[PDB]
């Protein structure tokens, strides 16, 4: 649940600390946070999960790479 809740906290705000939201609805699902060469994604069913470059990871770790 805290996953889906976190997504919602930034989809509201339009960004995180140095990361833009886009809501690029891609064939995968949707872009999440963008900064530099690094782009978090979120899925549509899971309800959401967090990939980066193909490595799929948990909320705890995601909050680390975004701080």
């Amino acid at each position: 649940t805290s996953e889906e809740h976190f997504v919602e906290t930034v989809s509201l705000a339009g960004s995180y600390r140095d990361w833009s939201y886009s809501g690029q609805r891609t064939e995968l699902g949707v872009e999440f946070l963008k900064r530099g060469d690094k782009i978090v994604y979120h899925t549509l069913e899971s309800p959401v999960e967090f990939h980066l470059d193909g490595e799929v990871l948990s909320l705890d770790k995601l909050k680390s790479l975004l701080s």
Side-chain angles (χ1 to χ4, degrees):
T1 28
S2 40
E3 307 100 287
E4 203 261 29
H5 175 74
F6 179 53
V7 173
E8 186 162 78
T9 313
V10 164
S11 66
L12 271 35
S15 26
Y16 207 69
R17 299 183 79 170
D18 288 94
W19 304 71
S20 216
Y21 191 98
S22 257
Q24 192 121 87
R25 261 274 224 80
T26 85
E27 67 207 316
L28 278 60
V30 44
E31 272 192 339
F32 197 36
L33 277 316
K34 314 175 84 180
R35 178 184 186 183
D37 300 303
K38 299 268 114 298
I39 290 201
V40 182
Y41 276 79
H42 65 129
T43 58
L44 304 175
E45 284 190 24
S46 259
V48 310
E49 223 123 281
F50 311 117
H51 316 172
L52 178 60
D53 267 72
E55 290 183 58
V56 180
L57 282 176
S58 36
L59 181 64
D60 180 75
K61 182 162 293 193
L62 176 60
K63 288 164 168 188
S64 215
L65 80 91
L66 291 179
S67 36

